[PDB]
């Protein structure tokens with residue numbers, strides 16, 4: 266094994282920072298990115314605490330579809346990255362880079378990435394120590410005849426150089442199963458047997474109308490636990506709102522895939538954190554997002570989605586490393602072997618732990634994410650683990666998985682009920698993680714959680730998550746319900762018919778809207794109420810270390826009822842928020 270160029274694990278997670286080449290400006294002799302970020306400026310802007318855990322991911326976007334264009338652009342940017350000087354210290358500090366080398370089946374009619382040979386990639390790895398990996402993303406809809414062979418070569422050339430091959434894919438049309446050899450294309454299967462320690466496999470939740478979120482995430486987790494990938498994660502994509510035909514928040518009717526550039530702006534900001542929790546809580550450690558202009562920002566500035574949700578989430582997962590592979594294995598009661606494509610795809614989990622066919626969220630944490638691997642693979646390495654002795658490894662074709670009812674009846678005997686209420690909650694050590702799982706319905710949810718004898722009841726609006734940690738002197742609370750008002754994008758349309766017929770915002774129009782109406786002059790959402798009730802408290806708790814998004818929260822209300830040894834905490838906010846409550850339990 267060649268020394269790894271970086272660590273990627275729970276203690277060293279990875280936030281990919283995408284920069285998409287501007288092919289129109291490339292044709293005019295300029296080297297630029299859509300949205301106006303620059304490589305140096307973007308890197309400089311990344312907070313210093315995050316720099317060790319962030320890597321610039323170049324994407325060739327709409328570079329011309331001709332030999333040389335992607336190599337030219339990439340070598341230009343690799344040079345810029347290599348020569349970077351920290352202006353505070355005057356030292357050359359090469360910027361870490363990942364190159365997007367494969368997308369859309371690398372068809373010559375889809376991408377300039379077609380003209381990037383493995384020979385060239387090897388040369389780049391050898392020339393640039395700061396090239397830490399290469400990325401394949403989104404080919405499920407154009408599954409090239411040689412995709413598995415090409416993936417084997419990407420993994421091998423990465424292993425040769427100590428880099429990572431990162432593949433983001435969704436299990437549409439059995440993509441993940443095929444990747445590992447389902448239909449007889451076994452080159453990548455063979456490559457993984459040798460080089461899995463250099464592989465990162467991620468979901469890509471873009472094709473949301475096909476409903477493969479839960480099954481793809483299950484595979485990513487299972488591939489990791491069974492030593493078919495070094496780590497896993499997800500690419501979470503606001504284009505899901507387009508794919509599913511949604512429009513104005515909470516409005517009725519479906520507009521189809523008709524208003525793309527308005528639609529990718531509309532997903533509530535905090536919902537990205539709800540999606541990201543599914544990665545974190547299940548041991549994933551790699552994060553990426555689209556559309557970059559909304560999720561990261563423009564012109565070397567952080568968008569509010571980035572600053573108030575993603576940045577704070579990613580800081581959290583650095584400060585509180587995700588559960589290790591060993592820990593997740595110890596916790597796993599059921600591991601599925603077999604093809605979700607034969608058992609209804611995402612329908613497998615509907616009314617088990619997801620509330621509908623097309624959602625990136627879960628409705629209960631009772632089973633967390635049940636891990637699986639495709640039928641083509643073997644569970645030999647999983648069984649060899651010292652930590653897998655208490656796992657029931659079950660064929661997907663088992664009677665226990667034959668129906669919705671059967672799945673719950675089986676799982677419920679191995680995963681006990683551990684909270685009450687129709688809300689998402691999952692516990693890890695002394696922390697309850699909670700969110701309202703509604704996607705586009707304006708409905709509050711409630712739950713009852715316990716820390717031993719201490720009872721905590723919560724009431725959450727949609728697009729709200731919280732982390733509640735029992736600490737020696739009370740409770741640490743992190744809350745995020747950040748959701749700006751996107752109604753302006755949908756003005757002039759009083760119904761779905763009218764909305765479908767709006768003028769197209771366009772790509773350039775959406776970037777301009779971000780500049781003019783999101784980076785500045787933001788239409789913030791209204792403050793909204795979260796309630797937290799603690800039962801089993803000695804005296805009025807004290808609040809400590811209150812902070813959050815500027816201008817986004819009223820002072821929390823504490824109403825202590827001595828007779829009933831309980832406090833009701835009322836928060837009115839729209840943003841991230843953190844505080845501690847100090848108290849003793851009543852006995």
Ligand SMILES: CC(=O)N[C@H]1[C@@H](O[C@H]2[C@@H](O)[C@@H](CO)O[C@H](O)[C@@H]2O[C@@H]2O[C@@H](C)[C@@H](O)[C@@H](O)[C@@H]2O)O[C@H](CO)[C@H](O)[C@@H]1O
Pocket residue numbers: 285299324326327368369402403471504505507508555556557772
């Ligand atoms: C045609 C277009 O609008 N291109 C943009 C767009 O691309 C997205 C978008 O079209 C969605 C619709 O659901 O489909 C893809 O996910 C697409 O992603 C882009 O193309 C695919 C094949 C991959 O290469 C992927 O990595 C890439 O992002 O939005 C993206 C930004 O989110 C770019 O701005 C494209 O130019």
